[PDB]
Design a protein around this ligand. Structure first.
Ligand SMILES: [Zn+2]
Ligand SMILES: [Zn+2]
Ligand SMILES: [Zn+2]
Ligand SMILES: [Zn+2]
Lengths: 107, 107
């Protein structure tokens, strides 16, 4: 019976308005898009950690004798129609994509 | 000095042509896109595992006494302009997003 070191959760989001852009800034995500000559809504598949606790580690199954650990949300980058001044831009926004375990060795 | 259980690698790809779609099928990814009234190329941020070996685990730092492990590439889903019959479709394709460690307990 298989499973991963950090438990994650994934959801589709379609009510997105605010996002952080590729170099750290906040931007506004528009509701709809016009690609080719069709109108589409903007969707996003996000994965967060369940237990990001940075003291009672959410990492399962570690050599805790030699190793410290926690669960962390990593990010990918997708393009989205945002708002630049006030005509739109196609820009890369950062989104939660996964939950990985991070280590450091003990003194 | 911090690091993660599985070593990953991330690259930008802009020469994508073939992809696997949301329910397992192959599709063709077009080179360019027309969003709003502007022409853009399609980009993708991909992350794979470095050591997906499923015998000498690439997972660092495990209670190997009680636990088996390997590194695996997980996937997210982004929309892209593909080719449906032969006018285009805005569809969700699967892309490598991250490298997580998977466990199973020992007999
Ligand atoms: Zn809303
Ligand atoms: Zn804000
Ligand atoms: Zn090429
Ligand atoms: Zn093919």
């Amino acid at each position: 019976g298989e499973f991963s070191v950090c438990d994650s959760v994934s959801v589709w989001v379609g009510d997105k308005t605010t996002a952080t852009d590729i170099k750290g800034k906040e931007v506004m995500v528009l509701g709809e898009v016009n690609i080719n000559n069709s109108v589409f809504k903007q969707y996003f598949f996000e994965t967060k950690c369940r237990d990001p606790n940075p003291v009672d580690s959410g990492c399962r199954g570690i050599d805790s004798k030699h190793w410290n650990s926690y669960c962390t949300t990593t990010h990918t980058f997708v393009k989205a129609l945002t708002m630049d001044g006030k005509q739109a831009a196609w820009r890369f926004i950062r989104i939660d994509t996964a939950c990985v375990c991070v280590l450091s060795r003990k003194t």
